[PDB]
A and B are shown apart, each in its own frame.
Chain A
């Protein structure tokens, strides 16, 4: 049975084609004092330093990436890779040389019988039961707007924003520090990440919410640190993710995610824009904030012509939408002849990936 591995900046999501979710989700890290990977690197981080092989969605350390994949096959999925066709995912606009490298490592290092690479955002659109739409995919490392028509991304219209989950975590840490707290270790970043995931939300109207926080204590929440100290989080709860709409909060001159969605749509043929506005699909961990869909609906409505039908689709399972799309694709009776086989690789070499995998 086929495997599905969705490799991200922050987390690996791995499993078997045909399952409704990944079997294992673990951090994309290698830690050294001879090395540990994933969940065990995380749990032993007291005595290790960590490296992340994927930066802003792109693999930049191939030797550590091989360790991550070994850990996925042998430690998490507990399979012999030579027995299983393997579907991997990639970022939009992934460099051509990277696609060839992934292919080469799968066949020559792990001896897979067959392999395929798919674009993450496109898998997410398929998981939502659509062939046309615009995906907002935001993880730990990178954010993209990917417009898609009749199954295929429109490359000229893709927007990439280097403002994602890790930047949000660092900013929450900055402003919580301003409130009087202190988070001096890399280990404590993981705590601030947890606060972010449990207590942050996107305000429908940012300036009104600030006024509420200033005139009442009703937005304040408590959070218990590992040493038992209970701290208070106020307007930081919604100031943190407001950064997605106002990147000037962390010094970036970029447009916020509402404006890049609009800019992306405006780069496409006027005849498909209506279908794009009606099919905005959110995927990835950083789209998980309560309130984000309602905020996006409001902001896009404000930018678009006033007769446009606007719809935001934010599935509850969207942390795993990419993975689920791959599970579905890999399971289809029609997909059997679409894999790159080991024989095809032996005859053609890694460049085969550009002809078999859009």
Chain B
């Protein structure tokens, strides 16, 4: 039902989305290959096989400074897309500085890194751990 799932993998080509505050947002086509190192992205390469079927490779790319909500969301979105494509995608984790040759080959004039990105979707909270240790007096109470 998500609009971008409806568009994914319909014809041969490259599709790139960026994780933005727990959503999958398409990257403008003219910015393909310029990755924010503060962000995480999902990439679907669709290849037309000679037998008429579509072949799918799903890569989630993790910038060196991307936040935990972003890398977690990229991974989950990748699973959900693969499931939506009847499991037929092969999944690839791509870390900045260590990307696969096939991923790098998607970008004809070479992929490039830029600093920055979209802010984390997490709200910051201060966890209260309520598990107090027993006092002298409590220990004496249990003895009796």
Residues of A within 8 A of B (CB): 11, 15-16, 18-27, 38-39, 42-43, 45-47, 76, 125-132, 150-152, 184-188, 190-191, 194, 226-227, 320, 324-325, 327-329, 331-334, 336-337
Q: List 22 A-B contacts (CB under 8 A).
A: A11-B131, A23-B125, A24-B128, A46-B134, A46-B139, A129-B62, A129-B75, A131-B78, A131-B91, A132-B91, A150-B87, A151-B91, A184-B143, A186-B142, A226-B133, A227-B139, A320-B127, A328-B22, A328-B68, A328-B72, A332-B22, A334-B80
Contact in complex: A188, B62 (CB < 8 Å) = no
Answer whether A333 and B69 are a contact pair too, CB < 8 Å, given A129-B62, A191-B133, A226-B134: no
Q: Does B138 contact A (CB under 8 A)?
A: yes
Interface size on B, residues (CB 8 A): 48
Asked if B138 and A18 sit within 8 Å, CB to CB, the answer is: no
Nearest-Cβ distance from residue B60 to partner chain A, whole angstroms: 8
Question: A25-B131, A47-B141, A187-B142 known; A129 and B68 CB under 8 Å?
Answer: yes
Counting from the closest, the 4 A-B pairs by CB-CB distance are A129-B71, A151-B79, A46-B141, A39-B130
Instruction: Give bound CA distance, A130 to B60, whole Å.
Output: 9
Among A18, A21, A46, contact of B137 (Cβ-Cβ < 8 Å): A46
Are A129 and B74 in touch, CB under 8 angstroms? yes
Residues in chain B near residue A20, CB distance under 8 A: 68-69, 120, 122-125
Q: Which residues of B contact A334 (CB under 8 A)?
A: 2, 5, 24, 76-77, 80
Smallest CB–CB gap between B93 and chain A, Å?
A: 6
Interface code B22-39, partner A: CB below 8 Å = 1, 0 otherwise?
Answer: 111000000000000000
Complex-state Cα separation, A336 to B76, whole angstroms: 14
- Which B residues have a C-beta under 8 Å from some C-beta of A? 1-2, 5, 22-24, 40, 60, 62, 68-69, 71-80, 82-83, 87, 91, 93, 120-125, 127-139, 141-143
Give every chain A residue within 8 A of B23 (Cβ-Cβ). 332-333
Task: Report whether B125 and A46 are in contact in the complex, using a CB–CB cutoff of 8 Å.
Answer: no
User: In the assembled complex, which residues on chain B have CB atoms less than 8 Å from the CB atom of A26?
Assistant: 129-131
A25 with B130: CB separation less than 8 A: yes
A191 to B138, CA, bound (A): 12
Query: Most chain-A CB neighbours within 10 Å: which of B79, B120, B121, B138?
Result: B138
Question: Roughly how many angstroms separate A185 CA and B137 CA in the complex, as a whole number?
Answer: 12
- In the assembly, what is the distance between CA of A307 and CA of B130, in Å? 47
Q: How far is the CB of A113 from chain B (nearest CB, A)?
A: 18
Tell me the bound Cα distance from A325 to B68 in angstroms: 9
Contact check, B125 vs A15: say whether CB atoms are below 8 A apart: yes
Contact B1 A337 (CB under 8 A): yes
Are A324 and B72 CB-contacts (below 8 A) given A43-B132, A187-B138? yes
Contacts of A22 in B (CB 8 A): 125, 127
A131 to chain B, nearest CB (A): 5
Query: How close is B127's CB to chain A, nearest CB, in angstroms?
Result: 5
List of B residues within 8 angstroms of A325 by Cβ: 72
Question: B22–A150 contact, CB under 8 A?
Answer: no
CA A152 to CA B137, docked complex, whole Å: 49
Q: Which of A11, A18, A131, A191 contacts B121, CB < 8 Å?
A: A18
Contact between B75 and A131, CB atoms less than 8 A apart:
yes
Q: How far is the CA of A327 from the CA of B127 in the complex (A)?
A: 14
Given contacts A131-B91, A150-B91, A190-B134, contact A126 B128 (CB under 8 A): no
Q: Report B128 CB to chain A, min CB distance, Å.
A: 5
Query: In the complex, A72 Cα to B73 Cα: how many Å?
Result: 26
**Closest residue to B134 on the A side, CB-wise?**
A187
Contact between chains at A333 and B91 (CB < 8 Å): no
